[PDB]
Design a protein around this ligand. Structure first.
Ligand code: TTP
Ligand code: CA
Ligand code: CA
Ligand code: CA
Length: 342
DNA sequence: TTAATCCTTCCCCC
DNA sequence: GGGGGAAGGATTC
């Protein structure tokens, strides 16, 4: 008996725009990031359900989304607001448990093995949490409930939007056989494809392969992960997480190779990155470059001390010269990433 | 206008 | 032979 409760906010960014302006609810709302290269360049960060049922979702080009819903409301993404609205909600969650793991800007795991004694009581603490968040911050969320972090999140995907579901041990047993391997957290397209070849379409299937052949295909961490889920031995603790890196990437108007033409962008990125750092001091710095064909290239350096703004400016141009040197393609997007704080 | 955890090398050295 | 760590890249959400 160890009951994990997972919370996930529905189409978060979009739902926040509906809160800050209710005249929006009911219509197709699409939050985008207008990269600025040309008219409507850029992608979609997220759309609400009214838009999603028509194909408009996160990842597609804004241009493509206007071909489908010329009259949907297109709003520019406001990262900062969403972040603060999230912090408030993350606090309402600490009112229910001491053991809370904040997965992303909208996902959180709460260990409530103690506060509750069985699934029934959980499902109640679930509706309770949903209703509290709805009245305090006006946001709908989906709640998953199960034995461990992995199934609690799977439950959530099955119950969204605005839902609540409990996956009990009998269902876990059948899911380890019926549930599609790809629907397992941490299994993207690439890992799903490698597993197709190894003849593993279901979780159970992993016990039919010799360990070392699975370790040579998808890595050891991933292998043990899938195997413990199959034998039903997975039981990761809910540890609190802490930012391990902050950075910013910007899109340049035109793809380039000229150093003096890229610097300006690179520098803007560093300014905004030190703003996000707020009091934090990084020892490591990484310059990140996105080539014209969308391949990511980067170069970094760890110092035995914190990096000051002057140092960042200076060190980044060097790493950028190290990038153009080793890479002969043109650069589409450029940015930096700081880490290893003091 | 958009962060995290492995994995694989490589190098230094006990 | 294996500890340690840094660097660049692969993958996922
Ligand atoms: C996928 C994606 C997400 N995001 C951000 C914005 C979203 O609100 C959030 C990511 O999507 P998700 O948080 O995983 O889910 P969503 O809440 O927006 O979708 P769902 O209806 O399933 O609840 O993270 C981006 O900025 N860009 C992207 O390409
Ligand atoms: Ca979500
Ligand atoms: Ca999410
Ligand atoms: Ca998947």
């Amino acid at each position: 008996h160890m009951i994990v409760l997972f919370v996930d906010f529905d189409y978060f960014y979009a739902q926040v725009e509906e809160v800050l302006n209710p005249s929006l609810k009911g219509k197709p709302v699409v939050v985008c990031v207008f990269s600025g290269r040309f008219e409507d360049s850029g992608a979609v960060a997220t759309a609400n359900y009214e838009a999603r049922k028509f194909g408009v979702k996160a990842g597609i080009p804004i241009v493509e989304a206007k071909k489908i819903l010329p009259n949907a409301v297109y709003l520019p993404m406001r990262k900062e607001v969403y972040q603060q609205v999230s912090s408030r909600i993350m606090n309402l969650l600490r009112e229910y448990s001491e053991k809370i793991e904040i997965a992303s800007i909208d996902e959180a795991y709460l260990d409530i093995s103690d506060k509750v004694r069985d699934y029934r009581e959980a499902y109640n603490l679930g509706l309770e949490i949903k209703n509290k968040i709805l009245e305090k911050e006006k946001i709908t969320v989906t709640v998953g409930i199960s034995k461990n972090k992995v199934f609690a999140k799977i439950a959530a995907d099955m119950a969204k939007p605005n839902g609540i579901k409990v996956i009990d041990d009998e269902e876990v047993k059948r899911l380890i056989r019926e549930l599609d391997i790809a629907d397992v957290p941490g299994i993207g397209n690439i890992t799903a494809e490698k597993l197709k070849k190894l003849g593993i379409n279901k979780l159970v299937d992993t016990l039919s392969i010799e360990f070392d052949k699975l370790k040579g295909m998808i890595g050891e961490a991933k292998a043990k992960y899938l195997i413990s889920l199959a034998r039903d031995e997975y039981n990761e603790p809910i540890r609190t997480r802490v930012r391990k890196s902050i950075g910013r990437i910007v899109t340049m108007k035109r793809n380039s190779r000229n150093l003096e033409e890229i610097k300006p962008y690179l520098f803007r990125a560093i300014e905004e990155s030190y703003y996000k750092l707020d009091k934090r001091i990084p020892k490591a710095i990484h310059v990140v470059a996105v080539t014209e064909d969308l391949d990511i290239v980067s170069r970094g350096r760890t110092f035995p001390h914190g990096i000051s703004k002057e140092t960042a400016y200076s060190e980044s141009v060097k790493l950028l010269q190290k990038i153009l040197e080793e890479d002969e393609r043109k650069i589409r997007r450029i940015g930096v990433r700081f880490s290893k704080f003091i």
